[PDB]
Coordinates of C-alpha atoms in Angstrom, one line a residue:
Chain L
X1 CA -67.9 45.1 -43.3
X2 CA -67.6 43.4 -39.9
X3 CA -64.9 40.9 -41.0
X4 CA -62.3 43.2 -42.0
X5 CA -62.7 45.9 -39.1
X6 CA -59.4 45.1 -37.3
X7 CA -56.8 45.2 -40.0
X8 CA -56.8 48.7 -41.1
X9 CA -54.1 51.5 -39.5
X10 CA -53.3 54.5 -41.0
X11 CA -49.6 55.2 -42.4
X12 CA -49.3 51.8 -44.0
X13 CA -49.2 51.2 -47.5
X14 CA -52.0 48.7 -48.6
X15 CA -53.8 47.4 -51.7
X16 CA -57.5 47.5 -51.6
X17 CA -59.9 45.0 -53.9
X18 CA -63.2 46.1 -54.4
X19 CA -66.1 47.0 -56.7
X20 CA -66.2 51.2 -57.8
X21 CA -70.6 51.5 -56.9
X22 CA -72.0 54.9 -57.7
X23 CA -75.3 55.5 -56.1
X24 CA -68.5 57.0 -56.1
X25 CA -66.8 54.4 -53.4
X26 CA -65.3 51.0 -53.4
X27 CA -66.8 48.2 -52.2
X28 CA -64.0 46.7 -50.3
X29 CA -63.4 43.2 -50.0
X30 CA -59.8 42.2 -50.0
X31 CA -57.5 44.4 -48.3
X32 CA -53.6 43.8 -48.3
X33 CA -50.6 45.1 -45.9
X34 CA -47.0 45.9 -47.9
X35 CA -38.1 45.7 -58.0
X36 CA -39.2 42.2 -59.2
X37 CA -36.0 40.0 -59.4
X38 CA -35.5 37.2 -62.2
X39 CA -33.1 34.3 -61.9
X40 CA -30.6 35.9 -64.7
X41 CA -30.0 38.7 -62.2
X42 CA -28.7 37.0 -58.9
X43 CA -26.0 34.9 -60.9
X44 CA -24.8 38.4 -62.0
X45 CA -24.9 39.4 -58.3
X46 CA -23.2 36.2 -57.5
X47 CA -20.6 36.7 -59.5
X48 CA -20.0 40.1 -58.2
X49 CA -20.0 38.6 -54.6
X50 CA -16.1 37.6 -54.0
X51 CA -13.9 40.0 -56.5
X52 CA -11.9 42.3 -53.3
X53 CA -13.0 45.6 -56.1
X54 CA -16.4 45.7 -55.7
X55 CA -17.0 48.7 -53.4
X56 CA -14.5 51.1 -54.2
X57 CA -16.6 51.2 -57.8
X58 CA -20.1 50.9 -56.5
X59 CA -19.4 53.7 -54.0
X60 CA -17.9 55.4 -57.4
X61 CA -20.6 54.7 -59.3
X62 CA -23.6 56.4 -57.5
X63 CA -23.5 59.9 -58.7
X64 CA -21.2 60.9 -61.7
X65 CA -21.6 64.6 -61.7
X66 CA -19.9 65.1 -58.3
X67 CA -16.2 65.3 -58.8
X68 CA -14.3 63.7 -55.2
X69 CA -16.0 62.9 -52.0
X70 CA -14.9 59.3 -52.3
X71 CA -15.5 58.3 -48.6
X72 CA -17.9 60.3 -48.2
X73 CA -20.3 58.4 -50.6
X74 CA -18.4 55.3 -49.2
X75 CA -20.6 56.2 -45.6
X76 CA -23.4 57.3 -47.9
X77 CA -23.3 53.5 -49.3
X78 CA -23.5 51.8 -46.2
X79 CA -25.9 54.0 -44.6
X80 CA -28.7 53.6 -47.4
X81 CA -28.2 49.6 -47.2
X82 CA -29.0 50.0 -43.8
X83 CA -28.1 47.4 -40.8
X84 CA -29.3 44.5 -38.9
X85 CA -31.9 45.7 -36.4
X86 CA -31.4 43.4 -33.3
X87 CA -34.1 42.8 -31.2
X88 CA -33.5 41.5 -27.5
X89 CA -35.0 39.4 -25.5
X90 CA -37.7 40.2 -22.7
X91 CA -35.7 43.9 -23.2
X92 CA -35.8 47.0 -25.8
X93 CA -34.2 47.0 -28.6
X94 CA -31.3 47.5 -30.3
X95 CA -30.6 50.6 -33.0
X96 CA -30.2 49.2 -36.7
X97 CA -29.9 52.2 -38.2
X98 CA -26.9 54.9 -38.9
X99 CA -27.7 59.1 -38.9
X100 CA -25.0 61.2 -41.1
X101 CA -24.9 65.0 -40.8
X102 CA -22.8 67.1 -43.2
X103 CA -21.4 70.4 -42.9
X104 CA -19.1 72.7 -44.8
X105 CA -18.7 75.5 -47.5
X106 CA -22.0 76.0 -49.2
X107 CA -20.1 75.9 -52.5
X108 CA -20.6 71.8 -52.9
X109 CA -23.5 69.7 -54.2
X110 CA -25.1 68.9 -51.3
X111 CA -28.0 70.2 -52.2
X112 CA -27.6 68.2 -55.5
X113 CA -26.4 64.6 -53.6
X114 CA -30.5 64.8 -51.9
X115 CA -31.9 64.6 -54.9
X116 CA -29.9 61.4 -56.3
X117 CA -30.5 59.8 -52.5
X118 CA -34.5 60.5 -53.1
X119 CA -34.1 59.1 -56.4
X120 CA -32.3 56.1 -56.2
X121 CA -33.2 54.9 -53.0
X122 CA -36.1 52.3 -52.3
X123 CA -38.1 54.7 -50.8
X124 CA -37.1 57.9 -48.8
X125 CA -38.8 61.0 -47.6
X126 CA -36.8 64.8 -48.6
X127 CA -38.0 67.5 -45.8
X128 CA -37.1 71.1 -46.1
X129 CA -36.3 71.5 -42.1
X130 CA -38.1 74.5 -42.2
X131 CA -41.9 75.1 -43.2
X132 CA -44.0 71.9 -42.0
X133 CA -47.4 73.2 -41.2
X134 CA -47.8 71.0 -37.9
X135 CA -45.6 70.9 -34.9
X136 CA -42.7 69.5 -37.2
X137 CA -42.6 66.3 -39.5
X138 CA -44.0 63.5 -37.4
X139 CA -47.4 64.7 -36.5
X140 CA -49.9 67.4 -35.9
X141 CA -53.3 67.8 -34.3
X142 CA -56.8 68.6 -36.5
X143 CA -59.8 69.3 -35.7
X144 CA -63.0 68.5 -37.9
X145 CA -66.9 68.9 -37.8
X146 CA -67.7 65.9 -39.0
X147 CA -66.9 63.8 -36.2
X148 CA -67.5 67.6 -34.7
X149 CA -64.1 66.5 -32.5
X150 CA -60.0 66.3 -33.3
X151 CA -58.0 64.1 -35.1
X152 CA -54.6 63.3 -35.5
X153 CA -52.4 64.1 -38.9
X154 CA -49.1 62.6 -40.0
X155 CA -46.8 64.8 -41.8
X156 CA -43.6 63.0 -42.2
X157 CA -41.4 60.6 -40.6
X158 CA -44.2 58.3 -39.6
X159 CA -44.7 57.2 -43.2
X160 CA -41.4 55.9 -43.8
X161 CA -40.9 53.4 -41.0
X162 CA -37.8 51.3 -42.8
X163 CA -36.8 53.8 -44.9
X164 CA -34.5 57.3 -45.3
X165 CA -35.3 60.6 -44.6
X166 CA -33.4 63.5 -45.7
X167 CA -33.7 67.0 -44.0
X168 CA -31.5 69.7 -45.6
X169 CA -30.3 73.5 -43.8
X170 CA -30.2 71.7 -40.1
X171 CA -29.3 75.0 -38.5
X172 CA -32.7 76.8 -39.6
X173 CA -34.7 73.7 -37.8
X174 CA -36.1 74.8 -34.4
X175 CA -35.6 73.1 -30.7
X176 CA -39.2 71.4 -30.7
X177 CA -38.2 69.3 -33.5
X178 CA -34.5 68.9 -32.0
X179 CA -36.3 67.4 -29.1
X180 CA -38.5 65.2 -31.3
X181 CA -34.9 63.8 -33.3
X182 CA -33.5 63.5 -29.4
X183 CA -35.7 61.1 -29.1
X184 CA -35.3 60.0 -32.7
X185 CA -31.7 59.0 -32.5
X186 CA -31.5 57.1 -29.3
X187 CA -34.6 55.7 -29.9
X188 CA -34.7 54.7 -33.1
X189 CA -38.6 55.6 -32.1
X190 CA -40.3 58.7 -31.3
X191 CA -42.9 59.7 -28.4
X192 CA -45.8 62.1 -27.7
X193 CA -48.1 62.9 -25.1
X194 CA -50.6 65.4 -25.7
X195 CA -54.2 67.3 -24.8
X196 CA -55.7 63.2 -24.5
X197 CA -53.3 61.4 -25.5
X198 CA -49.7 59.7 -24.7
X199 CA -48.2 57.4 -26.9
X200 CA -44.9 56.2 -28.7
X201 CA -44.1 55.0 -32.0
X202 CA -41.4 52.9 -33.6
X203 CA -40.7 53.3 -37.5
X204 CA -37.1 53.1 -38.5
X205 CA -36.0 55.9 -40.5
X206 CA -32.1 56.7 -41.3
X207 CA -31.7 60.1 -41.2
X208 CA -29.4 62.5 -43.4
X209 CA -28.6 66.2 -42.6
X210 CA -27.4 68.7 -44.1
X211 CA -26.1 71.9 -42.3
X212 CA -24.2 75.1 -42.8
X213 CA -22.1 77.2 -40.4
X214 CA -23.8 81.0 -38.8
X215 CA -20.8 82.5 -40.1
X216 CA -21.0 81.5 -43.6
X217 CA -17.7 80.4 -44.7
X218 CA -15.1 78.1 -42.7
X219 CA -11.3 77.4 -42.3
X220 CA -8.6 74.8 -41.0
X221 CA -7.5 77.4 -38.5
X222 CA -10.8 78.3 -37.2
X223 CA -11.9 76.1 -34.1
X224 CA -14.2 73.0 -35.4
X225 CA -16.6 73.0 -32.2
X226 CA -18.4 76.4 -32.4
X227 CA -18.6 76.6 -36.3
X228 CA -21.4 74.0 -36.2
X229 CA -23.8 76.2 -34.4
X230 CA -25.4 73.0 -32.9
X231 CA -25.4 71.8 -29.4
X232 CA -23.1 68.6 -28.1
X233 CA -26.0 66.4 -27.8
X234 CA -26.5 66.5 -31.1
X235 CA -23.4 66.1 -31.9
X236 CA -23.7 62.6 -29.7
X237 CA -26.8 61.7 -31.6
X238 CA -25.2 62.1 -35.7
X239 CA -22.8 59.1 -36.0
X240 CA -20.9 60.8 -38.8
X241 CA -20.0 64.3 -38.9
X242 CA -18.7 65.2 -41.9
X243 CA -16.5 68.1 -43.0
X244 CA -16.3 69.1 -46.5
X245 CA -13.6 72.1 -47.1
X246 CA -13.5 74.4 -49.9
X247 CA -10.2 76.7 -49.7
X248 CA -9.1 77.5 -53.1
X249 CA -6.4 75.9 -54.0
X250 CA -4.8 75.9 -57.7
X251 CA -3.5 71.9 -58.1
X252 CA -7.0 70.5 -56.8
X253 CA -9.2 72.7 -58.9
X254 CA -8.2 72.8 -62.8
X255 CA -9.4 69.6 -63.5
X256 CA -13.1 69.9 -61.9
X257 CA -14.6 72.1 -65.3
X258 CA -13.1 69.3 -67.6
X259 CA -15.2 67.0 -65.5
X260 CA -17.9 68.3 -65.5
X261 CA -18.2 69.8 -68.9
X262 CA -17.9 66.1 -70.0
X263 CA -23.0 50.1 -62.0
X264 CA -26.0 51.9 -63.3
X265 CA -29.5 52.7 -61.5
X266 CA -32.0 49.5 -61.6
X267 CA -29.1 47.2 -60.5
X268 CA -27.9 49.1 -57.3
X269 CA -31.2 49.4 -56.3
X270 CA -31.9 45.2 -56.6
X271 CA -28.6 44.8 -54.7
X272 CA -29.4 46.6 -51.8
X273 CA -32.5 44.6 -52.0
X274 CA -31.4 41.5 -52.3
X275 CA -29.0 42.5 -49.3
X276 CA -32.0 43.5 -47.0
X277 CA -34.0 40.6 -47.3
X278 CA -31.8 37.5 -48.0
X279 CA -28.2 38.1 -45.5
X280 CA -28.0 38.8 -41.8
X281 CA -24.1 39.6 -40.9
X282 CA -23.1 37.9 -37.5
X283 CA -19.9 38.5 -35.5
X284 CA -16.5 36.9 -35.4
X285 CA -13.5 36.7 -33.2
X286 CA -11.7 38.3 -36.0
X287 CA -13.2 41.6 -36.1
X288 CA -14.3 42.1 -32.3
X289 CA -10.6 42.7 -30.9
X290 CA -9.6 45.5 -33.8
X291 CA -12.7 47.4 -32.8
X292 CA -11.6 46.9 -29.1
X293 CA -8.2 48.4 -30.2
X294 CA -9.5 51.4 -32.6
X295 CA -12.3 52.3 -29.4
X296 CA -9.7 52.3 -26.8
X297 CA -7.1 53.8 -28.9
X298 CA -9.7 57.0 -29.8
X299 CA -10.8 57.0 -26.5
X300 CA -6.4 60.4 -28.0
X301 CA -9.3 62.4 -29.9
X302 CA -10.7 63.6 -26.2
X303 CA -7.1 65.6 -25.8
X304 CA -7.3 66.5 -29.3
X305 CA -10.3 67.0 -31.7
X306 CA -13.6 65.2 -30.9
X307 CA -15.4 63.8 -27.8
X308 CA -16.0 60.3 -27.5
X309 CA -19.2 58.9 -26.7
X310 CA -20.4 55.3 -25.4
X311 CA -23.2 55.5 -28.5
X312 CA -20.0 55.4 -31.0
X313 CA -19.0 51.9 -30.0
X314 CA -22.2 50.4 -31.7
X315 CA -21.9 52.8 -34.4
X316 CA -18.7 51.4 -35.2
X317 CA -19.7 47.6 -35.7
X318 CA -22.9 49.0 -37.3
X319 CA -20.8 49.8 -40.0
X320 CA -18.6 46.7 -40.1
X321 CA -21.7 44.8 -40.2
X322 CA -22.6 47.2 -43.3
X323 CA -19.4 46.6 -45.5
X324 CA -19.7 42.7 -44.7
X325 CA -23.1 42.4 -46.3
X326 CA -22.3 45.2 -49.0
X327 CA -20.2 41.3 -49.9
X328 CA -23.1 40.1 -48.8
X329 CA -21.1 37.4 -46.4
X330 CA -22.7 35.3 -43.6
X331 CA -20.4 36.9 -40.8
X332 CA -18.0 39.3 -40.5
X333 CA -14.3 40.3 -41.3
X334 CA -11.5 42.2 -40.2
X335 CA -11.4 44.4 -43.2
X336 CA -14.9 45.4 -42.5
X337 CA -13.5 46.9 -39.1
X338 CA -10.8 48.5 -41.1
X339 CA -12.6 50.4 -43.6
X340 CA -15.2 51.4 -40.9
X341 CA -11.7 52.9 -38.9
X342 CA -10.5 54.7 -42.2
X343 CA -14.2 56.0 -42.1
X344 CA -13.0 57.2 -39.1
X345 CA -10.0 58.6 -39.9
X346 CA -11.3 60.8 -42.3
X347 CA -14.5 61.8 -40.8
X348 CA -13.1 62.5 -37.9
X349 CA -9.4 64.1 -38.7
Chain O
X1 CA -59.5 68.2 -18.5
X2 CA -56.9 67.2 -20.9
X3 CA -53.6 66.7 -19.0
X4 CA -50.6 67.6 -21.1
X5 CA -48.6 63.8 -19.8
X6 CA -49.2 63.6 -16.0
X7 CA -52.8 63.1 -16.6
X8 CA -53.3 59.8 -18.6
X9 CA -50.2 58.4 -16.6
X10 CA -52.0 58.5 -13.1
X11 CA -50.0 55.7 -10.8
X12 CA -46.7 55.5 -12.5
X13 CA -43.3 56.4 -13.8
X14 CA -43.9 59.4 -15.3
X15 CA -40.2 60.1 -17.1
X16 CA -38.3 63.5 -18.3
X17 CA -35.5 63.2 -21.2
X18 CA -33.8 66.0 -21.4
X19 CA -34.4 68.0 -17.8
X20 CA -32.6 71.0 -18.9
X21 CA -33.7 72.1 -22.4
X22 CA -37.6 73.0 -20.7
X23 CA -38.2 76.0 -19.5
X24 CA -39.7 77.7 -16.1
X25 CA -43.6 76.8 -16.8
X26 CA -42.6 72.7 -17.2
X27 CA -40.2 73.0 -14.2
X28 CA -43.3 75.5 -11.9
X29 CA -45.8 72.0 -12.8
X30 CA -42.9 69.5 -12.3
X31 CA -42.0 70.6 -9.0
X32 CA -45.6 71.0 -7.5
X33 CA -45.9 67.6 -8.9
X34 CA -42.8 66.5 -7.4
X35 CA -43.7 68.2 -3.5
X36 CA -47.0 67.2 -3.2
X37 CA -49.0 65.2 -5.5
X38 CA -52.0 66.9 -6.6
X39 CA -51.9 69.6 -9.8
X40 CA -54.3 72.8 -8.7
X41 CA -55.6 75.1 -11.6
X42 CA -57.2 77.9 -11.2
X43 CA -58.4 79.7 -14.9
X44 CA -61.0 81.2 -16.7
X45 CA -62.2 77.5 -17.2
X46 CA -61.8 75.7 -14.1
X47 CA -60.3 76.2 -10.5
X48 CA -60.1 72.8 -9.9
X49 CA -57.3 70.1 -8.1
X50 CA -56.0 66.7 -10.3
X51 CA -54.7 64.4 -8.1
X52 CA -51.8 61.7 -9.6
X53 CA -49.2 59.9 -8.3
X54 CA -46.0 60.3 -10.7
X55 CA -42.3 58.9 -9.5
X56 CA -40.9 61.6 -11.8
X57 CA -37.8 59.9 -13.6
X58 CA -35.4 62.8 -14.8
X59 CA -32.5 62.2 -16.9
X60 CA -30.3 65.4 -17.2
X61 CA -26.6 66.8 -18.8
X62 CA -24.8 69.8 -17.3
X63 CA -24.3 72.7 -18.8
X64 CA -21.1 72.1 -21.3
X65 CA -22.3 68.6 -22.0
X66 CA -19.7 66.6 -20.0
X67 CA -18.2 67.5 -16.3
X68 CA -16.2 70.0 -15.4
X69 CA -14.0 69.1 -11.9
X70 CA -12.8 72.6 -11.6
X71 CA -15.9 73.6 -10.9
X72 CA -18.5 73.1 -8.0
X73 CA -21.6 71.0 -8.3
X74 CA -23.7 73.5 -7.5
X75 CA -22.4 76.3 -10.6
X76 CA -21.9 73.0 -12.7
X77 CA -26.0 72.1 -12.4
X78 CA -28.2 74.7 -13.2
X79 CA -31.3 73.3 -11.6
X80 CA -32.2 75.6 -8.2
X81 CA -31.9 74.2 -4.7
X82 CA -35.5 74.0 -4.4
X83 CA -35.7 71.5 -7.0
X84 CA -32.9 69.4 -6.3
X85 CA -33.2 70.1 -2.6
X86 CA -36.8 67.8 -2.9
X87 CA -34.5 65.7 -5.2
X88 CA -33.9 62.8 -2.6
X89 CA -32.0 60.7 -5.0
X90 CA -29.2 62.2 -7.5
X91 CA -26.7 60.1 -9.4
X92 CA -23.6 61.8 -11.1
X93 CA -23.3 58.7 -14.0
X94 CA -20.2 59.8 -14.8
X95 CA -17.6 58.3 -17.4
X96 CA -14.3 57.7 -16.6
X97 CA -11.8 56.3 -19.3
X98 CA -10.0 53.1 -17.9
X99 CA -7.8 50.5 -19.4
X100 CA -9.4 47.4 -17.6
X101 CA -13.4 48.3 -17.2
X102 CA -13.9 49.7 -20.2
X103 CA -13.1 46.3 -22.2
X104 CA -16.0 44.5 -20.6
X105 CA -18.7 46.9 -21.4
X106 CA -16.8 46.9 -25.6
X107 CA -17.3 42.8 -24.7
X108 CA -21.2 43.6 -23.3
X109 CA -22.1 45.8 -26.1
X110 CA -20.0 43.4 -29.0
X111 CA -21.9 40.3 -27.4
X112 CA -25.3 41.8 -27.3
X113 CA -24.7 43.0 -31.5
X114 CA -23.4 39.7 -32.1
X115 CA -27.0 38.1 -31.2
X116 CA -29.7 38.7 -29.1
X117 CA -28.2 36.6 -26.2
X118 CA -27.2 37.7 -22.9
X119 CA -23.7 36.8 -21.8
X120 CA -23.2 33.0 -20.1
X121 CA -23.5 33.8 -16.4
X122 CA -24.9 31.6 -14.0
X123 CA -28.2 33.0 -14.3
X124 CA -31.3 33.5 -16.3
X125 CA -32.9 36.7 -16.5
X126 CA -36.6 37.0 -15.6
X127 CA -39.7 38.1 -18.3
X128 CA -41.6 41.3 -17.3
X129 CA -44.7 39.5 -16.0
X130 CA -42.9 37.6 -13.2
X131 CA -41.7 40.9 -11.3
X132 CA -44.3 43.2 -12.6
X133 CA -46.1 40.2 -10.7
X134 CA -44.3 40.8 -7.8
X135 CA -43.8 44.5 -7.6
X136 CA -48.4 44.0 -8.1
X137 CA -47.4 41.4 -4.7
X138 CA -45.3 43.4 -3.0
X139 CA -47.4 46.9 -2.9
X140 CA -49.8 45.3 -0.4
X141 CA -47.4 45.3 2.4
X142 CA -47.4 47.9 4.9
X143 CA -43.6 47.9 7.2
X144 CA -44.1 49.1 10.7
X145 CA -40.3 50.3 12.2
X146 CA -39.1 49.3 15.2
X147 CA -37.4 50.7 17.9
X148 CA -33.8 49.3 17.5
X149 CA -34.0 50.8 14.2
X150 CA -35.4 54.2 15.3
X151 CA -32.0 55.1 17.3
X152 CA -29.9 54.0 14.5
X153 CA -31.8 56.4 12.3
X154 CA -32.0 59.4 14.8
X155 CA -28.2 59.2 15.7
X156 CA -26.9 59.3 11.6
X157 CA -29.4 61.3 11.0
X158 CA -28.0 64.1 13.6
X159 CA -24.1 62.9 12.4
X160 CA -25.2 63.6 9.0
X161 CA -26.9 67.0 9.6
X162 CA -23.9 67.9 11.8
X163 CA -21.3 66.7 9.2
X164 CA -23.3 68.5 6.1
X165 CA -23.7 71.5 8.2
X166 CA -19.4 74.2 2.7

């Protein structure tokens, strides 16, 4: 009707109210925008709030049939619980959330870790990289004889606006959606201008890649630049790069068939939650001068390994803020700084 | 007509992210764009002339990422002399590690994720409506030079051609 004519957008999730007619359609008259959580629940996640142990076994606890990748699930923690998303006044604003790209042997689960993010998650979109019918994930154009004129379709990445998005086998993905994730990383947005049209659009959604080297395997010894078959910009757009080697080795590996030829999922999920809605982390004195430190101290790595970009400075209180309401405290702490620089350490070294 | 960009921004900033991942058939509409303002086409369609004003905005990297001060501007940008010749305006942003300037920009960038305030200078910063107001002002003038100014500009303009003419 004529009441309800400006409320209605496509790529939100709504609840219609209405009457099913058959002269088969809905007679709409109440339209609405959008884990239920009792009061025995938040004492248990009170309790949990100030014991020093708590992460170490919730970033343990996520996926049992994975043998090792401790800190890696550690990142993979604070990157699905997401960060603060600081808007500015009378200017743009500020990134919330945190990209991880991983690389390595194919011999891993990788493959198998998307499929426990999809699941457990609140809500997240899995991609292939390779195969979207449109110009990539975030839109295409259509045309239809009804209206006898074209229209516009969302594939992907416009659907989830706070969510994650997981695109596995990064290398196969082609430039025009390398520009479109240019613009996703910085932006935190995504733009277009096409045949009648120019517009932008702002829906957060974390991103997680998975990639695999052109020459199929990879060593210590080999140089770590060129074996990523991506270009430096993108490198400067993923926060964490991580390496997962898989030289045999005789010590390491007897115990991984005993493993695997041997808290839980609805309270994780309430938590992160419960995180995202109720606490907003601010800054401290405390943890602003050991960033300052572990910044200008890195920016050693330059001579060494890695490049150091001006993006990685809010990447690395992004994660502070992460671990300080993983405790779900008010502000932050100095510990938060120092697990975010052994995050470092062994993401980057 | 249905103007890939340059078309449905007619009097504006018309911006570029990522100058040199395009390719020759951006840059051959960027740069008639750029000389004189007024696309021509000329097809099986149309052979007609769009006319738009666009202060292109372009926002580059070289060509392994980061600098290189062994090697000339010139080989370290790959953009043509035609194209950079029009260029009035260039600036090389380039990052230098320091010891004292780069802890105020980790101060800037720790005080603007701490809250949403700017730091406590003495002075307020204006909301876009006041200056978009007076940039909407300030179009309407129309500067006459003088002649005090005109031998000023003649005699560094002839130093400057002299000192750039390797």
């Amino acid at each position: 009707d004529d009441d309800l004519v400006d409320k209605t957008k496509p790529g939100d999730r709504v609840n219609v109210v209405g009457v099913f007619k058959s002269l088969t359609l809905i007679l709409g008259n109440t339209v609405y925008p959008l884990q239920m959580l009792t009061d025995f629940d938040i004492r248990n996640i009170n309790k949990l709030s100030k014991k020093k142990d708590i992460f170490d076994i919730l970033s343990q606890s996520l996926a049992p049939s994975i043998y090792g990748h401790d800190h890696i699930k550690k990142a993979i923690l604070l990157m699905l619980m997401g960060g603060v998303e600081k808007n500015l006044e009378n200017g743009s604003h500020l990134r919330g959330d945190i990209n991880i790209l991983m690389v390595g042997d194919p011999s891993t689960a990788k493959s198998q870790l998307l499929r426990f993010v999809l699941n457990t998650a609140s809500l997240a979109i899995a991609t292939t990289g390779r195969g979207s019918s449109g110009v990539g994930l975030t839109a295409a154009v259509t045309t239809d004889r009804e209206t006898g004129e074209r229209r516009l379709e969302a594939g992907a990445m416009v659907l989830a606006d706070r969510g994650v998005v997981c695109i596995d086998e990064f290398d196969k993905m082609t430039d025009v959606d390398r520009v479109a994730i240019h613009e996703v990383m910085e932006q935190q947005t995504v733009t277009i201008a096409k045949a009648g049209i120019h517009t932008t659009l702002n829906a957060r959604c974390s991103v997680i890649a998975a990639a695999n080297p052109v020459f199929g395997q990879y060593d210590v010894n080999r140089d770590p630049h060129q074996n990523i078959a991506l270009p430096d910009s993108l490198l400067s757009r993923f926060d964490l790069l991580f390496v997962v080697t898989d030289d045999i080795n005789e010590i390491r590996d007897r115990s991984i068939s005993e493993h695997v030829l041997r808290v839980t999922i609805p309270f994780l999920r309430k938590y992160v939650q419960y995180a995202k809605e109720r606490v907003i982390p601010q800054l401290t004195q405390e943890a602003i001068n050991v960033i300052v430190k572990n910044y200008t101290d890195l920016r050693d790595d330059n001579t060494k390994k890695s490049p150091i970009t001006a993006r990685t400075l809010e990447t690395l209180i992004r994660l502070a803020t992460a671990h300080a309401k993983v405790r779900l405290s008010k502000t932050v702490n100095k510990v938060d700084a120092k697990v975010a620089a052994n995050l470092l350490r062994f993401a980057l070294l | 007509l249905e103007g890939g960009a340059l078309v449905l921004a007619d009097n504006g900033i018309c911006c570029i992210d990522e100058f040199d991942k395009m390719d020759e058939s951006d840059r051959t509409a960027i740069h008639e764009v750029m000389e004189q303002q007024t696309i021509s086409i000329s097809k099986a369609g149309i052979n007609t002339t769009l006319n738009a004003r666009t202060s292109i905005l372009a926002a580059a990297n070289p060509l392994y990422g980061r600098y290189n001060p062994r090697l000339s501007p010139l080989d370290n940008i790959n953009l043509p002399a035609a194209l950079l010749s029009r260029f009035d305006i260039l600036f090389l942003m380039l990052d230098i590690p320091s010891r004292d300037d780069d802890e105020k920009l980790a101060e800037h960038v720790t005080y603007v994720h701490m809250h949403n305030k700017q730091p406590d200078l003495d002075f307020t910063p204006v909301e876009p409506s006041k200056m978009r107001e007076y940039i909407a002002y300030a179009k309407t003038k129309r500067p006459v030079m003088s002649e005090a100014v005109n031998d000023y500009v003649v005699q560094a303009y002839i130093r400057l051609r002299q000192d750039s003419k390797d």
